Amino acid sequence: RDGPLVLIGSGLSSEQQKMLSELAVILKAKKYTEFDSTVTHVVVPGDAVQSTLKCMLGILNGCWILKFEWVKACLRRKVCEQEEKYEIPEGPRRSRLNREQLLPKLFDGCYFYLWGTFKHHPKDNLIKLVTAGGGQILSRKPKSDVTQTINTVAYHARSDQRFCTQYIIYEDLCNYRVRQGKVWKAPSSWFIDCVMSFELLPL
């Protein structure tokens, strides 16, 4: 049997947030305001999925990512309603079936060096996401000592990305030869897009 649900809201209204907490006590579960691996459900306000850290952490966690009409229906009925109808399609579903099937994490076998400055999605956010996605953080800019001898494969790679698993992530002007050796150059937008689609996208 399942543990009690652990819910969280992302980009929710103030009313929607009151409504959500009213469900938690009714469904006899916790509601959180900060994301944790124990979170079962992430509720978004609309239908589009949000590029917030919580929604992203939830996708990598294989959580239900559901429209707010789910909470409405739950309060309306005072039951846990079945989630699929409210699930946000594409990446979140993909990720949840990956979790349910015990398949490896999105960035499994991959390594990431975060180069330069990050405004849009800060650096600490990126670190959290590489770690939540089963990826590893390179503390040094990859050149050719450890670089060739890294011999992992990436499950979610289609592709040279299967076995060239190291990434220099940038936001700033990075002129270039997208791959040199086992190391790719990729903008953070590519990384974010991977997470939102639950996909190791081609470069």
- Could you tell me which of 169, 137, 166 has the C-alpha nearest to residue 149? 166
According to the entry, how was the structure determined?
X-ray
The residues near 148 (Cβ < 8 Å, ≥ 6 apart) are 181, 182
Collapsed DSSP state (helix, strand, coil) of residue 37: coil
In this structure, the number of other CB atoms found within 10 A of the CB of residue 24 comes to 17
CATH 3.30.465.10 fits 1-102, yes or no: no
Helix (H) or strand (E) holding 149: helix 146-149
Contact yes or no for 98/62 (Cβ under 8 A):
yes
Side-chain half-sphere CA neighbours of 90 within 13 A: 11
Domains 1-102 and 103-199 are alike in CATH topology: yes
Contact yes or no for 186/177 (Cβ under 8 A):
no
**Domain 103-199 -> CATH class:** alpha beta
Q: Which DSSP category does 59 fall into?
A: H
Contact yes or no for 78/133 (Cβ under 8 A):
no
- Could you tell me which of 118, 108, 1, 130 has the C-alpha nearest to residue 56? 130
**Every domain of the chain and the residues it spans:** 1-102, 103-199
The residues near 47 (Cβ < 8 Å, ≥ 6 apart) are 67, 88
Question: Resolution reached, in Å?
Answer: 2.2
State the Cα–Cα distance between residues 20 and 26, nearest whole angstrom.
10
Query: Directed axis angle between helix 53-60 and helix 123-132, to 10°?
Result: 20
What are the CB-based long-range contacts (under 8 Å, 24+) for 160-166?
Answer: 161/200, 161/202, 161/203, 165/109, 165/110, 165/111, 166/110, 166/111, 166/112, 166/113, 166/138, 166/142
State the Cα–Cα distance between residues 123 and 53, nearest whole angstrom.
12
